[PDB]
Amino acid sequence: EAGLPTVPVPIPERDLDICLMKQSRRTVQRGGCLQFQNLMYRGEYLAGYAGETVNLRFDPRDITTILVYRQENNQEVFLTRAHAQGLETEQLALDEA
Amino acid sequence: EVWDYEQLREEYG
Amino acid sequence: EVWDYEQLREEYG
Amino acid sequence: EWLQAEIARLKGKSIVPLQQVKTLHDWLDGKRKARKSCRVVGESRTGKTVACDAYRYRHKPQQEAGRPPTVPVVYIRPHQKCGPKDLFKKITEYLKYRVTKGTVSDFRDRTIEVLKGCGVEMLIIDEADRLKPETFADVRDIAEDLGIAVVLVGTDRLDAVIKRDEQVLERFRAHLRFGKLSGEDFKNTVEMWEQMVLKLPVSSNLKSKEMLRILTSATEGYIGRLDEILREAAIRSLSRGLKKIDKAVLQEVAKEY
Amino acid sequence: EWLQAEIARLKGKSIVPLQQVKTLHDWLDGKRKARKSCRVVGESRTGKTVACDAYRYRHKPQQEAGRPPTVPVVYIRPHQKCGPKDLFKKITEYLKYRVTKGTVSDFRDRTIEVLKGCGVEMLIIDEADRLKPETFADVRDIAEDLGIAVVLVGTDRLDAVIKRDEQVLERFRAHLRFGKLSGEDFKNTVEMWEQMVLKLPVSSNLKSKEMLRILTSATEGYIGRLDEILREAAIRSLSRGLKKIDKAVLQEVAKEY
Amino acid sequence: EWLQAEIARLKGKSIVPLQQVKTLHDWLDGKRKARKSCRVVGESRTGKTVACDAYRYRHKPQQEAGRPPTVPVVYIRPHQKCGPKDLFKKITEYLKYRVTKGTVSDFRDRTIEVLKGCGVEMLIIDEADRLKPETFADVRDIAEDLGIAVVLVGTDRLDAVIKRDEQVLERFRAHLRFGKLSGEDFKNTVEMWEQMVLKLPVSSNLKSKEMLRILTSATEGYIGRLDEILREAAIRSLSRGLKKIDKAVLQEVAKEY
Numbered sequence: 095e096a097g098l099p100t101v102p103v104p105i106p107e108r109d110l111d112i113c114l115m116k117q118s119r120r121t122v123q124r125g126g127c128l129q130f131q132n133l134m135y136r137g138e139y140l141a142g143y144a145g146e147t148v149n150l151r152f153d154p155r156d157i158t159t160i161l162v163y164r165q166e167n168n169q170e171v172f173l174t175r176a177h178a179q180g181l182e183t184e185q186l187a188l189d190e191a
Numbered sequence: 192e193v194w195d196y197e198q199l200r201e202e203y204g
Numbered sequence: 205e206v207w208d209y210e211q212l213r214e215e216y217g
Numbered sequence: 218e219w220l221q222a223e224i225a226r227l228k229g230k231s232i233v234p235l236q237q238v239k240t241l242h243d244w245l246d247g248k249r250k251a252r253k254s255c256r257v258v259g260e261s262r263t264g265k266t267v268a269c270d271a272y273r274y275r276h277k278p279q280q281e282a283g284r285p286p287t288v289p290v291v292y293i294r295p296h297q298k299c300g301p302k303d304l305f306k307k308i309t310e311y312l313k314y315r316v317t318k319g320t321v322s323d324f325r326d327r328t329i330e331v332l333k334g335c336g337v338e339m340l341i342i343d344e345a346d347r348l349k350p351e352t353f354a355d356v357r358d359i360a361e362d363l364g365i366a367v368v369l370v371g372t373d374r375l376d377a378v379i380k381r382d383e384q385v386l387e388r389f390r391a392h393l394r395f396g397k398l399s400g401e402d403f404k405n406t407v408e409m410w411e412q413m414v415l416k417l418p419v420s421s422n423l424k425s426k427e428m429l430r431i432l433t434s435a436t437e438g439y440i441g442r443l444d445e446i447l448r449e450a451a452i453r454s455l456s457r458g459l460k461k462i463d464k465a466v467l468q469e470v471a472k473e474y
Numbered sequence: 475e476w477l478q479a480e481i482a483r484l485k486g487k488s489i490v491p492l493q494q495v496k497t498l499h500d501w502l503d504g505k506r507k508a509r510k511s512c513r514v515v516g517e518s519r520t521g522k523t524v525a526c527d528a529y530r531y532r533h534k535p536q537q538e539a540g541r542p543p544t545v546p547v548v549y550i551r552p553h554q555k556c557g558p559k560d561l562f563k564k565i566t567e568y569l570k571y572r573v574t575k576g577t578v579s580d581f582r583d584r585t586i587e588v589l590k591g592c593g594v595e596m597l598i599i600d601e602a603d604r605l606k607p608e609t610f611a612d613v614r615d616i617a618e619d620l621g622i623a624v625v626l627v628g629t630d631r632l633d634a635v636i637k638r639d640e641q642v643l644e645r646f647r648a649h650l651r652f653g654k655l656s657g658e659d660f661k662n663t664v665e666m667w668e669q670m671v672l673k674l675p676v677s678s679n680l681k682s683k684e685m686l687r688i689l690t691s692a693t694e695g696y697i698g699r700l701d702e703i704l705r706e707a708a709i710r711s712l713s714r715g716l717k718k719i720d721k722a723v724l725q726e727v728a729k730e731y
Numbered sequence: 732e733w734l735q736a737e738i739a740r741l742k743g744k745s746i747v748p749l750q751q752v753k754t755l756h757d758w759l760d761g762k763r764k765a766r767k768s769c770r771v772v773g774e775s776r777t778g779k780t781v782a783c784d785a786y787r788y789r790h791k792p793q794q795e796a797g798r799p800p801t802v803p804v805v806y807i808r809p810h811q812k813c814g815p816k817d818l819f820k821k822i823t824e825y826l827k828y829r830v831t832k833g834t835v836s837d838f839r840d841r842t843i844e845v846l847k848g849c850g851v852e853m854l855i856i857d858e859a860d861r862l863k864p865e866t867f868a869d870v871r872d873i874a875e876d877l878g879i880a881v882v883l884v885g886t887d888r889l890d891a892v893i894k895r896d897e898q899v900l901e902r903f904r905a906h907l908r909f910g911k912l913s914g915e916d917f918k919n920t921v922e923m924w925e926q927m928v929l930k931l932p933v934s935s936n937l938k939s940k941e942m943l944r945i946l947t948s949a950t951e952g953y954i955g956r957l958d959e960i961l962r963e964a965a966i967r968s969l970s971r972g973l974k975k976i977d978k979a980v981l982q983e984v985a986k987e988y
């Protein structure tokens with residue numbers, strides 16, 4: 095408590111979580127579909143980005159709601175939550191999948 | 192309602 | 205009753 | 218001669234009025250009244266094609282003297298990789314017209330002209346997964362520009378094709394599922410076959426547990442497996458000189474699956 | 475007869491003056507004043523086509539004796555893989571001209587000639603994603619050589635096509651979004667459908683929370699799901715003697731989607 | 732009515748003496764003196780077409796009594812998929828001749844005859860990437876056999892096309908790059924638009940910090956975004972009975988981009 099140059103900022107816990115999520119590369123393909131571990135997903139703006147690779151963040155405890163990111167101006171930007179179609183109801187862990 | 196959709200075509204020609 | 209595939213094909217004519 | 222005549226019957230096809238057929242028909246009748254597009258989905262050999270043929274045969278082309286026929290229900294099975302002209306040719310040749318050599322635009326205008334005037338109100342596309350991605354736009358335009366209930370039929374392959382075009386997905390999302398048979402319906406279905414399809418001169422007793430249990434394991438409740446096993450079992454039993462299917466031939470058949 | 479008339483009516487189609495429609499109309503009026511090309515983008519069955527149809531009907535051609543018509547707004551919905559002659563065909567036929575067989579150059583020159591003098595101010599291309607990439611050059615030339623606001627309408631499939639040509643992307647950058655309904659807006663919309671579309675002998679009270687829960691779940695707020703579900707449920711109700719939607723038949727319809 | 736008169740002006744188009752335009756004109760004057768073929772390249776809506784169009788007006792056809800016109804600069808924008816006959820028609824009809832139906836050889840020889848005698852020094856081909864690979868050989872033969880500086884204008888899509896034939900690429904190596912505005916150059920351009928183009932009854936101070944911030948981010952320095960944003964923002968303000976572009980109106984436009 096005495097040896098801190100300044101008291102740390104109270105981190106927004108969703109931001110911590112978002113940067114704790116592991117991530118993979120896939121390309122949005124035809125119809126705004128993207129494959130990830132046999133599941134398929136889509137979200138509210140995906141199809142406009144069909145044809146290029148996007149960065150998407152996943153939590154192995156619940157893969158059903160992916161967060162997907164574009165790279166533009168060589169900067170990361172969030173697109174939308176890509177939901178596993180028909181599974182937007184209860185959680186699925188990666189290990190059984 | 193606004194219109195019958197088929198009736199608009201006969202109105203429009 | 206049963207519907208014969210031949211009978212329904214011929215009756216269709 | 219006896220043997221050839223009963224075998225030439227048994228190698229044929231026949232349509233049994235399953236409850237699965239009736240629920241489809243009552244559903245397609247509601248969809249046709251609403252002109253509502255929809256899809257029929259279910260596992261292979263669940264009877265989807267035979268039930269759709271049965272629906273088409275109940276809603277016959279009506280003749281009127283010197284008119285083109287009134288055809289309420291069109292049924293087509295596309296060939297694989299069905300493009301727009303292939304679809305238009307199949308529709309226009311189901312109505313009693315020849316195609317003339319022409320552009321895709323000529324085939325379209327002629328198809329739209331004859332889907333009207335023949336008074337078409339439902340179009341069933343069996344194995345709709347054979348449609349090319351581009352031709353679904355003409356299917357959607359038929360469903361949108363005319364008040365026609367388009368019925369897409371296929372297995373889960375169709376859901377894999379449809380979900381890759383949200384405009385198709387969102388138009389054909391109303392569905393009916395064809396199931397496996399089971400239980401008392403499966404028992405009741407087996408009972409019908411020997412008396413309504415096979416009609417060998419002596420009772421086969423296929424309902425009996427030692428037969429019914431094998432048929433359960435061999436067919437798994439697929440109506441197509443149930444039919445093809447029993448037809449082949451009757452044919453082989455007759456060819457051995459027997460008046461009926463014996464369990465020995467039934468085991469001899471069921472082991473081939 | 476009552477029943478056949480009500481089913482033939484309610485199988486039909488009608489336009490409801492939703493807020494999304496008025497919002498697009500005010501935005502399109504601004505773009506038409508400024509002659510600014512733009513795009514309308516939104517998910518399937520959000521109502522974009524109906525709202526663009528409603529706009530051209532508010533802006534009907536003005537007839538003048540012995541002149542060709544003054545047609546401020548042209549609306550076209552291209553066929554799949556729309557080439558440049560197909561596009562010129564669509565526009566000239568909309569202006570009440572007949573095409574004469576000829577070259578692409580003849581079709582272009584004739585189209586430009588009639589876009590002039592018919593006084594066209596806005597060209598709406600519904601499902602512009604069906605245009606071939608070569609066809610967008612001729613759409614840009616219409617927008618650039620003439621004082622015509624071109625409006626491309628599509629799903630996000632359009633944006634995937636637009637981004638593939640910088641010159642299209644930079645001309646059609648201004649956009650309006652069509653989104654899902656929610657909240658009070660969904661509640662007032664279902665209330666309007668029961669008041670002014672279903673027109674049934676008895677009130678259905680779909681506004682009430684335990685029915686609103688069913689509609690919100692099945693429709694996801696898509697207006698096209700809402701419309702198709704309620705008409706189907708009504709036709710089912712009237713066919714079975716129910717003088718209103720009842721929660722059971724509503725639940726039966728919603729289950730199919 | 733004054734509002735409709737101001738809207739009729741603002742929805743129009745005008746040419747502003749920007750520094751980028753001046754830079755191109757001096758460069759094109761040097762290429763025309765040397766009869767040196769070159770390309771002008773730059774992102775869409777950086778103003779290349781306006782700058783080339785302003786050039787041909789500054790070097791317009793010079794009349795001599797009973798002669799064909801002396802035309803130093805020919806400017807053409809080819810139609811999509813321009814073949815050689817289309818190119819020859821484009822050039823010959825710019826020179827105020829009428830093409831007569833004929834072979835490609837007839838069209839070529841007449842074009843060559845009128846490129847001489849009209850004393851053409853420079854041929855600017857805007858959107859040169861619309862040329863077929865077939866017709867680039869005739870473009871090169873015009874540059875080589877006549878003393879003519881051909882100027883190919885386009886985006887990076889032109890460089891992609893040009894790269895596919897060494898003979899085109901190596902003749903059109905010299906280039907001038909159009910680019911995005913920034914900094915004081917962008918700041919001066921916005922103040923010049925308020926002065927010269929908008930001409931509103933009250934100063935909008937569009938070069939103020941909170942205005943420059945949203946204009947910088949919406950336009951990204953594209954002159955075509957700046958023009959079309961300020962046009963519609965002025966139309967909206969004047970339609971609203973404002974005598975100024977207000978900050979909120981400009982923010983409403985900027986969010987559409």
Ligand SMILES: Nc1ncnc2c1ncn2[C@@H]1O[C@H](COP(=O)(O)OP(=O)(O)OP(=O)(O)O)[C@@H](O)[C@H]1O
Binds near residue numbers: 235260264372
């Ligand atoms: N109602 C029925 N009556 C008699 N036999 C039937 C019936 N339904 C199915 N069959 C038998 O099952 C076979 C397969 O049925 P059908 O062709 O209709 O299946 P399907 O679901 O359309 O199959 P697939 O998806 O593989 O094309 C028939 O050819 C026939 O042998």
Ligand SMILES: Nc1ncnc2c1ncn2[C@@H]1O[C@H](COP(=O)(O)OP(=O)(O)OP(=O)(O)O)[C@@H](O)[C@H]1O
Binds near residue numbers: 490517518
């Ligand atoms: N304003 C409205 N009033 C009444 N019904 C409407 C309205 N808007 C939409 N609908 C209903 O929703 C259906 C789908 O709407 P619409 O065809 O306009 O969708 P869309 O957004 O153009 O779809 P897509 O992108 O799939 O072509 C209509 O055909 C109609 O049944």
Ligand SMILES: Nc1ncnc2c1ncn2[C@@H]1O[C@H](COP(=O)(O)OP(=O)(O)OP(=O)(O)O)[C@@H](O)[C@H]1O
Binds near residue numbers: 641748958959
């Ligand atoms: N010098 C200028 N003065 C005024 N407005 C200009 C000027 N240059 C460009 N603009 C504005 O920018 C718009 C686009 O410019 P222009 O047509 O020259 O672009 P371009 O570089 O040829 O584009 P593209 O490569 O996409 O065809 C013009 O229509 C006009 O609104």
Ligand SMILES: [Mg+2]
Binds near residue numbers: 265266267343
């Ligand atoms: Mg089948």
Ligand SMILES: [Mg+2]
Binds near residue numbers: 522523524
């Ligand atoms: Mg639509």
Ligand SMILES: [Mg+2]
Binds near residue numbers: 779780857858
């Ligand atoms: Mg240009």
